[PDB]
Amino acid sequence: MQNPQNLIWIDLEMTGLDPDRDVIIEMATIVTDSDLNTLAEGPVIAIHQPEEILAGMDEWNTRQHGQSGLTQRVRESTVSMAEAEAQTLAFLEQWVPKRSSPICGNSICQDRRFLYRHMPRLEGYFHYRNLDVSTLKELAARWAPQVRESFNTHLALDDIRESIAELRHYRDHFIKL
Amino acid sequence: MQNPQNLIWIDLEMTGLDPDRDVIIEMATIVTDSDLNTLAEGPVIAIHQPEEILAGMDEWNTRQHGQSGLTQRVRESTVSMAEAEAQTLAFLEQWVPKRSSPICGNSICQDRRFLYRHMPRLEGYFHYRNLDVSTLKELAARWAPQVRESFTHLALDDIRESIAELRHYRDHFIKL
């Protein structure tokens, strides 16, 4: 069932932009094979945080997490950061061995940095490689603007599915295979 | 000469890979146009650090920076972290507007970590995205190994190698 060529896709929500001063409040994962076929969708987990952390968010995060329902889900969650990390690792372990997959998604440098601080056991499960779909988004915007225009989610798994679909789009119309 | 499509390529040397423990000791930049033609090579700056910081390096870093001459350059340098950041920003502003170019190069998430901690105004000058050539290398390793297999110790050569690597993928891995 484990395959070292399978890909781990991850997306997080955070209370702010600083991986060391802010925290993770939501995570989700999807596993694909190396040709981007979805093998399994992981758990979507709202991570409990104290009220003062929620009250401390800036105006943008307060509005966005408020109206998406995440703020309420964080208040009501009984899942700690460590429990969410363990739940996600239990899912990924069924599909990918340790240190085999890059971290995959859009601008996943930000996600890796938050994982390194807040979920280091999960961060350490990834290969050191980053697979950043937004690197290809930037190159397509400058070299083939038509490929971008030929391609507005808020739910966690919708966001990851769109990242996978974006890479599939570049593999099909931007990359010479 | 500012152009929002110009790309900023950067290279850093550090005392180690942990921004809480380690500091930047060398930086270099190159600006290209959007089609990877060099517009200008930026300053290569050895950043002064006191002796205790230099003696606190592990075995690999002490030996690599000692043998390369960077340690001695750092010891003699009269440029602080803030002054190196300012000098690099003064160069970049002549070619690229603020928040327009991603950080371009190889293994640049680690670069962004060190800039965020030690040179936050330079870090904020980039777009938040990374243009990391290793994303193309990984995809080529999986989907076209022959292009990856078909493809320097000083800072400007290091950056130029990354530009050439991206050019290689543009010519043989991207269809335009």
Which alpha helices (H) appear in chain B, and where do they start and end? 51-55, 59-68, 70-76, 81-92, 108-118, 120-125, 133-143, 145-149, 155-172
Q: Which residues of A touch B34 (CB under 8 A)?
A: 142-143
Asked whether the beta carbons of residue A138 and residue B128 sit closer than 8 angstroms, the reply is no
Exposed, middle or buried by CB within 10 Å (0-12, 13-18, 19+), for A49? buried
* A7-174 homologous superfamily: Ribonuclease H-like superfamily/Ribonuclease H (3.30.420.10)
Q: Per the structure block, which two tokens stand in for A151?
A: 């391609």
Separation CA B20–CA B48 (nearest Å): 18
From the list B102, B113, B134, which residue is nearest A130 (CB)? B134
Q: Quick one: which of B151, B134, B133, B109 has its CA closest to B12?
A: B109
Cβ(B44)–Cβ(B77) below 8 Å: no
Return the bridge partners of B7, or none.
Answer: B32
Q: Per the structure block, which two tokens stand in for B48?
A: 């002064």
Cβ(B135)–Cβ(A131) below 8 Å: yes
Max Cα separation, chain B?
A: 52
Resolution of the experimentally solved model in angstroms: 1.9
Q: How many CB atoms lie within 10 A of CB B42?
A: 24
Residues 6+ apart with CB under 8 A from B78: B48
Q: Quick one: which of B173, B149, B20, B13 has its CA closest to A140?
A: B173
A-to-B residue pairs, Cβ atoms closer than 8 angstroms: 72
Distance from CA of A166 to the nearest CA of B (A): 14
Q: Per the structure block, which two tokens stand in for B15?
A: 């005392």
Structure determination technique employed: X-ray
Record: fold of B7-173: Nucleotidyltransferase; domain 5 (3.30.420)
Separation CA A10–CA A105 (nearest Å): 6
